[PDB]
Amino acid sequence: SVRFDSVGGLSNHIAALKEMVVFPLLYPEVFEKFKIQPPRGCLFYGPPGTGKTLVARALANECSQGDKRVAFFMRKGADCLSKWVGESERQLRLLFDQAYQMRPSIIFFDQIDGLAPVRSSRQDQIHSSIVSTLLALMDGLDSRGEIVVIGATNRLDSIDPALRRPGRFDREFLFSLKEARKEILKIHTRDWNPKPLDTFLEELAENCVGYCGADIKSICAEAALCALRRRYPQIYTTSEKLQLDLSSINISAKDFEVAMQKMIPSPGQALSTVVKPLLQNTVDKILEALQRVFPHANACYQPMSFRPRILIVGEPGFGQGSHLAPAVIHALEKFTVYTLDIPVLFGVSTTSPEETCAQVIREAKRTAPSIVYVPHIHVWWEIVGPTLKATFTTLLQNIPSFAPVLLLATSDKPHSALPEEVQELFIRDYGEIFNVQLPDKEERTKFFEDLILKQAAKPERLKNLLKTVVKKSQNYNIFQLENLYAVISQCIYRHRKDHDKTSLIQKMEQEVENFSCS
Amino acid sequence: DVDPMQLDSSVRFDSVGGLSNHIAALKEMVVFPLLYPEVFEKFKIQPPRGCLFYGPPGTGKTLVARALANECSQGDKRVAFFMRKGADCLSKWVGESERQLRLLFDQAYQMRPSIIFFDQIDGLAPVQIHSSIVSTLLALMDGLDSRGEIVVIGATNRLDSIDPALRRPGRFDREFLFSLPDKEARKEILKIHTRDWNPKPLDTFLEELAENCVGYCGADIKSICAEAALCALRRRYPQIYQLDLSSINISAKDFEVAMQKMIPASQRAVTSPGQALSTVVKPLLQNTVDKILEALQRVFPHAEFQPMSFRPRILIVGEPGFGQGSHLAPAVIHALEKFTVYTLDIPVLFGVSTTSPEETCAQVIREAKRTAPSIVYVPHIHVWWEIVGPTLKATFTTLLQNIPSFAPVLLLATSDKPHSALPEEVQELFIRDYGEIFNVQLDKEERTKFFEDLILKQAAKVVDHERLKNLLKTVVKKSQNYNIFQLENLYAVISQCIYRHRKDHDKTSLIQKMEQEVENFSC
Numbered sequence A: 001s002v003r004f005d006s007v008g009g010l011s012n013h014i015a016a017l018k019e020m021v022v023f024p025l026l027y028p029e030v031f032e033k034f035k036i037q038p039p040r041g042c043l044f045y046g047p048p049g050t051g052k053t054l055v056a057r058a059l060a061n062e063c064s065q066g067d068k069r070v071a072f073f074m075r076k077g078a079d080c081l082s083k084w085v086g087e088s089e090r091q092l093r094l095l096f097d098q099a100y101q102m103r104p105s106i107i108f109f110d111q112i113d114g115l116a117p118v119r120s121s122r123q124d125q126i127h128s129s130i131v132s133t134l135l136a137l138m139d140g141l142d143s144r145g146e147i148v149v150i151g152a153t154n155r156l157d158s159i160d161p162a163l164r165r166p167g168r169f170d171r172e173f174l175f176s177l178k179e180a181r182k183e184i185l186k187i188h189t190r191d192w193n194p195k196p197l198d199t200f201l202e203e204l205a206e207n208c209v210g211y212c213g214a215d216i217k218s219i220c221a222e223a224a225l226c227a228l229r230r231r232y233p234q235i236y237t238t239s240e241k242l243q244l245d246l247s248s249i250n251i252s253a254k255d256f257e258v259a260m261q262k263m264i265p266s267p268g269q270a271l272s273t274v275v276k277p278l279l280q281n282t283v284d285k286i287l288e289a290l291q292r293v294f295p296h297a298n299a300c301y302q303p304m305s306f307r308p309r310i311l312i313v314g315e316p317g318f319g320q321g322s323h324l325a326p327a328v329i330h331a332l333e334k335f336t337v338y339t340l341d342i343p344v345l346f347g348v349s350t351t352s353p354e355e356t357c358a359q360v361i362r363e364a365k366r367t368a369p370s371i372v373y374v375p376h377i378h379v380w381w382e383i384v385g386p387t388l389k390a391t392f393t394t395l396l397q398n399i400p401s402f403a404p405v406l407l408l409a410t411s412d413k414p415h416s417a418l419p420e421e422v423q424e425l426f427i428r429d430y431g432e433i434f435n436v437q438l439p440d441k442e443e444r445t446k447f448f449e450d451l452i453l454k455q456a457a458k459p460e461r462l463k464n465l466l467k468t469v470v471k472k473s474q475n476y477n478i479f480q481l482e483n484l485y486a487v488i489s490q491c492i493y494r495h496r497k498d499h500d501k502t503s504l505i506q507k508m509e510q511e512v513e514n515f516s517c518s
Numbered sequence B: 001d002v003d004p005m006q007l008d009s010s011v012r013f014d015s016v017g018g019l020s021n022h023i024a025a026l027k028e029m030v031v032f033p034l035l036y037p038e039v040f041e042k043f044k045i046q047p048p049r050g051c052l053f054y055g056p057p058g059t060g061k062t063l064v065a066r067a068l069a070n071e072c073s074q075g076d077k078r079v080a081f082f083m084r085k086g087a088d089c090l091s092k093w094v095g096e097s098e099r100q101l102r103l104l105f106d107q108a109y110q111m112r113p114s115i116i117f118f119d120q121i122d123g124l125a126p127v128q129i130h131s132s133i134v135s136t137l138l139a140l141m142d143g144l145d146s147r148g149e150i151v152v153i154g155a156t157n158r159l160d161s162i163d164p165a166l167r168r169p170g171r172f173d174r175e176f177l178f179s180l181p182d183k184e185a186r187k188e189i190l191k192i193h194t195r196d197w198n199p200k201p202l203d204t205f206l207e208e209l210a211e212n213c214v215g216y217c218g219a220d221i222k223s224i225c226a227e228a229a230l231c232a233l234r235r236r237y238p239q240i241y242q243l244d245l246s247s248i249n250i251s252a253k254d255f256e257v258a259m260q261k262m263i264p265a266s267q268r269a270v271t272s273p274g275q276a277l278s279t280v281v282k283p284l285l286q287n288t289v290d291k292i293l294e295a296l297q298r299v300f301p302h303a304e305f306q307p308m309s310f311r312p313r314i315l316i317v318g319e320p321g322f323g324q325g326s327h328l329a330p331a332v333i334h335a336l337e338k339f340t341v342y343t344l345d346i347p348v349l350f351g352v353s354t355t356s357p358e359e360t361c362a363q364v365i366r367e368a369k370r371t372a373p374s375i376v377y378v379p380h381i382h383v384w385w386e387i388v389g390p391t392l393k394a395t396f397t398t399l400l401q402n403i404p405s406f407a408p409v410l411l412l413a414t415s416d417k418p419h420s421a422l423p424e425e426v427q428e429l430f431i432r433d434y435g436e437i438f439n440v441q442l443d444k445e446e447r448t449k450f451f452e453d454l455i456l457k458q459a460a461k462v463v464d465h466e467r468l469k470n471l472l473k474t475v476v477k478k479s480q481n482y483n484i485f486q487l488e489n490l491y492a493v494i495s496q497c498i499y500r501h502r503k504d505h506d507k508t509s510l511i512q513k514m515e516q517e518v519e520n521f522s523c
């Protein structure tokens, strides 16, 4: 039922899997020209929840539909278990021949852990002969095509070590657990009478942090199930269905949100729904400046730079590391990010801090371009020992000059107050230091539109009130603004069940005048 | 898994390149007793029956073993082959392991002949979970009769982690070092893996290919040769994604794009310190690099290959920013190929191999003394000296006296402070009147050469072609006192101004841009 249309996000995995597995089986005479000798053993491995067997079934559909030029047999290495001496043994030679009498073919082996476990002194002589003669079945009945052994498992070490030898089972395909999620939401709701809004589904996928595929459909089914709970609360404690129209179970804005809150669900995090219209301008500005310094976000017509470096400096309480920098990291996605802070350096024992400080830089060198994050450099410099500072400096210096790896750091004290070793590390004469500024008047004006007023009247003079709140908030930092918002929004809850107005507005207007934060 | 592995008949000593002295000595231990059974009984010989392979991974450690197994099994069918890998769900678990080893040796004696191959012994017999296994292993290996006919072959990546009771003649008597191949062996490997190809590349093409590949080991060559073909195939037929096998041949521009898409094995785990001087900066420092190697032959006359040398030392001193320890030193290390290098730096003493820093220093000193000639490399000595405790300073200073006088071990060091500034103990190692101290410096011509094919040609890919010369003179005059980091920055700030004007077909709206930028640029 799936022909590469119920798969979301896997734009690059498909190209690799088809080119090195199916195409050599789809076009075997081509590789006779150069003698590539493609491997005869392939695997699907990764964390659970990646949907490994469905890909094999899709390959079966692709190969079977047509002229039957390449085939596929579906097999499981966990239901192929026979409690007899050698009866499950014939399954592979017949299968490696049944798929060979009608070759080419791809044979899937789900959970080979049971059919071919680790033969040992505790395992049955049955399974001992099974595994021995079984590896004899595969390494002997291969090496000329056109059978490519594809298997799946949850753990890589759950395989008999004699299987993974030269000239035997070799290849491994990494399946991992957000760009896939838009495609997933598009696909899995292909036939829905209450078709949700595209922004509705995008918010759904945004709020489904940590889910991998199956639970993505599970939440949708659960949302429908609780929709018929909420629209029809009388389903409990009622007689047989007498009059129920099964069309008012339509999913609206609040249905999935009440559905999401009924189960438990990196230094990059976008702003909240309340914070976005306050710092979005500054995030865009810093992104633009970074574009200017860092062009990656002999021969010409190729981007090049000289040691990408940048420092965020702002007065404490300006949210330069509390809200800005993780947001910038989130905005500059599709690049590897690697932090270096105290709980990641001292948070693991059985290792010297020097032992991990080299691994991050080495592996970020491997995957250039990469991002290294060092928050609160003004305090991180005074916690490490004398050797760590020197090791950090030498590791940073050993980078190539034209390597497009960016150093991102944030600070609280002004640049002129830092230790001198930091000072002769940034080039303020260049574009390497960015300043954070207080929000302007429009942002503060638009920060209070929702509560004043789009929900208070939900079942004048307050406008003067409104401007007074702004008339005092010219020079308050982010934390004071947000705490003020929370304290005002509390009173709105305080009189939910008071239809009579002019008494709640009195208490709001007297609390705002009473709010002293000098 | 005691069954022999069905090896291909295509590996018959014709797929091994540059390993000739090793094969020339291996065949007189295995083959000759069997093929000349009368000459070993002329008087008495009893040839040996065991050898160790040690060295970095990826140097054809197993390929020679498979080739030996196949080539031997030709006139004495069948020579048995047994393949076991160390640390394979068998260690740290007793007492099944001794039963397994005894069974393997019994069946091997039953076969007669056989070749037993223990791979990665480092995890089997470490330097009564572990005592009982090593004891029975060595008792069994001593219980082998002299004529055998059992030959035991061990492989490892580090020699330091083996029992000292095994390296005795009678168990593991002869040791073999498998180092990286040099340029000649690299060309030989290229010729071997490109044998069944009808568009045979030219010899000069192979020479330049061999020169363009440094720090590579066997598998890198295989991957590059196997993926350049896929690059050509991908480029030829993009409409097929019946097929025509007529024009899928490989050409240039396919080898270099192949070079782009992965990293060498040396940048993965080996982490070699020597790194080739960049093509952008080459015409700025090539003369200096050639000059240093000229002054290196005064003290270490092995570099021009009864060569007698006495304590070869060298130290290149300069200003903080002249690129001593950033560009020059890895280049000089690079040009001295065929000499093994061992590194002594902060990341190596401390991060890797978390034991006392007192151990790795002794290990690298002894290993360097064992395989002379070699280079011991300790850069940034004015910072290295002030991080270590007095114990390691004493250890290091005393280990440099135990080398024999005429042993060819070169010490390479770099520094930023002037000679008289360094602490007096370090000063009591370099004897400048002997010629052990080099001073580095920053000409008009060399930077002129650095600039013209950026400010003339790359900016000409309507053009005035007159004020470019004046701009070149102005900027060159302006750059009379910058250091290397600054000088290589102006190149990156002008080319970016060019990139920002990619589609500007009029090359006049940008001229004033540079004629203002170079005056708004400051050191």
Ligand SMILES: Nc1ncnc2c1ncn2[C@@H]1O[C@H](COP(=O)(O)OP(=O)(O)OP(=O)(O)O)[C@@H](O)[C@H]1O
Residues within 6 Å of the ligand: A048, A049, A050, A051, A052, A053, A111, A153, A154, A212, A213, A214
């Ligand atoms: N990434 C995914 N995309 C789509 N459907 C998925 C995904 N992951 C899981 N599913 C669905 O949930 C089911 C559970 O997956 P499955 O049990 O095969 O994986 P597993 O956790 O490795 O377990 P096991 O190997 O024991 O079967 C799948 O059969 C499929 O219906």
Ligand SMILES: Nc1ncnc2c1ncn2[C@@H]1O[C@H](COP(=O)(O)OP(=O)(O)O)[C@@H](O)[C@H]1O
Residues within 6 Å of the ligand: B015, B016, B017, B056, B057, B058, B059, B060, B061, B062, B063, B189, B217, B218, B219, B222
């Ligand atoms: N000299 C060589 N000639 C041809 N191939 C080589 C050579 N050295 C290494 N290889 C490649 O390396 C692989 C074997 O590496 P191996 O010697 O097993 O390294 P290790 O023993 O450290 O795993 C082979 O697949 C082969 O293609």
